[PDB]
């Protein structure tokens, strides 16, 4: 979910 | 297929809605609006990786208790929390012998339902006979009505 969301992967 | 629900019981719900939006883009261009093979494929692709539809449909079926065959959005959230590191460590034979000498208070080499019942009543959680019953049955693959020691390894394989 980080490789997906970048900054938006905060809990992800 | 359930431990993921048990882990989200331990986890938060903000991750659930982040995965709601995830599922939404996970079907961005979908044929079925749920995660089939190619949906999970474009998931991995947006992930920067390229999967094969077999393991795609398999992780689709890796939760498949009923034979649902697909990734329901509920089953989707199941699959997405499958990849968060929540509970690990695969408990097994050695400590299970250490604990089975107890769980076999009858020392049968097989946990009769007596010990399992009593130690569940001791677990502190609410104890249904669905608990003790399913636990006897999953332990006992020989279905002897008593959880053999290796049937007890089964009984406590991995359940963090």
């Amino acid at each position: 979910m980080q490789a997906l969301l970048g900054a938006r992967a905060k809990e992800s | 297929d359930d431990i993921y629900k048990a882990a989200v019981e331990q986890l938060t719900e903000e991750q659930k809605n982040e995965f709601k939006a995830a599922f939404d883009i996970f079907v961005l261009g979908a044929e079925d609006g749920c995660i089939s093979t190619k949906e999970l494929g474009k998931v991995m692709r947006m992930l920067g990786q390229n999967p094969t539809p077999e393991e795609l449909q398999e992780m689709i079926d890796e939760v498949d208790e009923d034979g649902s065959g697909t990734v329901d959005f509920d089953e989707f959230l199941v699959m997405m929390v499958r990849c968060m590191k929540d509970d690990s460590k695969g408990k097994s034979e050695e400590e299970l012998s250490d604990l089975f000498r107890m769980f076999d208070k009858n020392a049968d080499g097989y946990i009769d339902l007596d010990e399992l019942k009593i130690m569940l009543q001791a677990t502190g959680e609410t104890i249904t006979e669905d608990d003790i019953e399913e636990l006897m049955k999953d332990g006992d693959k020989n279905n002897d009505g008593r959880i053999d020691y290796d049937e007890f390894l089964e009984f406590m394989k991995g359940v963090e």
């Binding site: - | 044929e31 093979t37 190619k38 449909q57």
Partner: protein, 57 residues
């Protein structure tokens, strides 16, 4: 005149390509949907194989 011919060739091209892209997109989705089905037939083909092979066993 050449820019307009180019407008027509790049636009016709875009339309030919949109048509091709659509043909390829449909073939993509058709083959993808049919792939999932071909895979499901393979699963079923392997499934019926296993049912009969298992009976054989």
């Amino acid at each position: 005149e050449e820019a307009e011919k180019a407008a027509d060739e790049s636009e016709r091209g875009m339309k030919v390509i949109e048509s091709r892209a659509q043909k390829d997109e449909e073939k993509m989705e058709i083959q993808e949907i049919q792939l999932k089905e071909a895979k499901h037939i393979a699963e079923d083909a392997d499934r019926k194989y296993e049912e009969v092979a298992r009976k054989l066993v």
